[PDB]
Amino acid sequence: RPDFCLEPPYTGPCKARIIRYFYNAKAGLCQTFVYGGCRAKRNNFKSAEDCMRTCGGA
Amino acid sequence: YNRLCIKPRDWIDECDSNEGGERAYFRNGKGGCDSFWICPEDHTGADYYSSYRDCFNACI
């Protein structure tokens, strides 16, 4: 799987309260986190399915 | 080489058999193996080496 999938979730410097999905490598599946609205990193998905397709076993 | 020889890096706490712990043996990086009592919530369901002999013969 891509290396960016192993990075911690990044809320960022903005103040929005948007729920996004990130792949948690310790658990082996995608979980939710709060995203601030700007400067997203790559481990940040709008749907769990897209997150698993990208990071589940790629 | 079997990945089961390597203790998962995130496992820190051990659990006694009276609380569901299961004994496994992993390589120790010093020519041998050491026992580790795996907590139910950390266990992957894999069939880890269950004796010192099996770990020593497969991992060292």
From Swiss-Prot, chain A:
The record marks K15, A16 as: Reactive bond for trypsin. Keywords: Disulfide bond, Pharmaceutical, Protease inhibitor, Secreted, Serine protease inhibitor, Signal. Residues 5-55 form the BPTI/Kunitz inhibitor domain. The keyword Ribosomal protein does not apply. One of its GO terms (biological process) is negative regulation of serine-type endopeptidase activity. Coiled coil: none annotated. Disulfide bonds join C5-C55, C14-C38, C30-C51. Inhibits trypsin, kallikrein, chymotrypsin, and plasmin. This is Pancreatic trypsin inhibitor. It comes from Bos taurus.
Swiss-Prot record, chain B:
Residues 5-59 form the BPTI/Kunitz inhibitor domain. Coiled coil: none annotated. Disulfide bonds join C5-C59, C15-C39, C33-C55. Keywords: Disulfide bond, Protease inhibitor, Serine protease inhibitor. The keyword Disulfide bond applies. GO terms for molecular function: serine-type endopeptidase inhibitor activity. The keyword Disulfide bond applies. TAP is a slow, tight-binding inhibitor of blood coagulation, specific for factor Xa. The inhibition of factor Xa seems to be reversible and stoichiometric. This is Tick anticoagulant peptide. It comes from Ornithodoros moubata. The lineage of its organism: Eukaryota, Metazoa, Ecdysozoa, Arthropoda, Chelicerata.
